């Protein structure tokens, strides 16, 4: 079985709209979402379909871009750092589970470089 996917909605959570969060959805997420290497990261890892029975034994903090997208659409993040941390958990999860040179790792590394550049270009907090 798969675990429940991470929380993406929480009506009682602290909520605000900021120019850096708008940028993270409009620029960072969407730039990564259209990438030719995005598809394995666009939804939670399905350990049943992929026959990875050990995945959720090793990965205890799952994360993916589908969850990030929904968290941004739902204003779930209070600041850019909370969003950035989820991206970094997605990347590191992939490097922990897999091995250097694996196709899935090469894909994550392409996305990570783009992400890093987009965070360098974060607009000034307004
Ligand atoms: C380029 C490799 C494609 N092979 S695959 O059988 O479709 C496939 C295998 C494994 C995954 C998981 C593993 C992982 O760490 N993820 C973010 C996703 C996803 C897809």
UniProtKB/Swiss-Prot annotation:
Disulfide bonds: none annotated. Ubiquitously expressed. Signal peptide: none annotated. There is a cross-link at residue 57 (Glycyl lysine isopeptide (Lys-Gly) (interchain with G-Cter in SUMO2)). JQ1, a thieno-triazolo-1,4-diazepine derivative, and I-BET, a benzodiazepine derivative, have been tested on tumors with success. Treatment with GSK1210151A (I-BET151, a I-BET derivative) has strong effets on mixed lineage leukemia and promotes myeloid differentiation and leukemia stem-cell depletion. Belongs to the BET family. Interacts with p53/TP53; the interaction is direct. Interacts (via CTD region) with CDK9 and CCNT1, acting as an associated component of P-TEFb complex. Interacts with RELA (when acetylated at 'Lys-310'). Interacts (via NET domain) with NSD3, CHD4, BICRA and ATAD5. The interaction with BICRA bridges BRD4 to the GBAF complex. Interacts (via NET domain) with JMJD6 (via JmjC and N-terminal domains); the interaction is stronger in presence of ssRNA and recruits JMJD6 on distal enhancers. Interacts with NSD3. Interacts with NIPBL. The NET domain mediates interaction with a number of chromatin proteins involved in transcription regulation (NSD3, JMJD6, CHD4, GLTSCR1 and ATAD5). The C-terminal (CTD) region mediates interaction and recruitment of CDK9 and CCNT1 subunits of the P-TEFb complex. It is also required for maintenance of higher-order chromatin structure. This is Bromodomain-containing protein 4. It comes from Homo sapiens (Human). The chain holds residues 44 to 168 of 1362 of the full protein.
């Amino acid at each position: 079985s798969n675990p429940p996917p991470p929380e993406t909605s929480n009506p009682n959570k602290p909520k605000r709209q900021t120019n850096q969060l708008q940028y993270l959805l409009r620029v960072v997420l969407k730039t990564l979402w259209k990438h030719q290497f995005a598809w394995p990261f666009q939804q939670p890892v399905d350990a049943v379909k992929l026959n990875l029975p050990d995945y959720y034994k090793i990965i205890k903090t799952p994360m993916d871009m589908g969850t990030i997208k929904k968290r941004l659409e739902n204003n779930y993040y209070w600041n850019a750092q909370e969003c950035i941390q989820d991206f970094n958990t997605m990347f590191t999860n992939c490097y922990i589970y897999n091995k250097p040179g694996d196709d899935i790792v090469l894909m994550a590394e392409a996305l990570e470089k783009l992400f890093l550049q987009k965070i360098n270009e974060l607009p000034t907090e307004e």
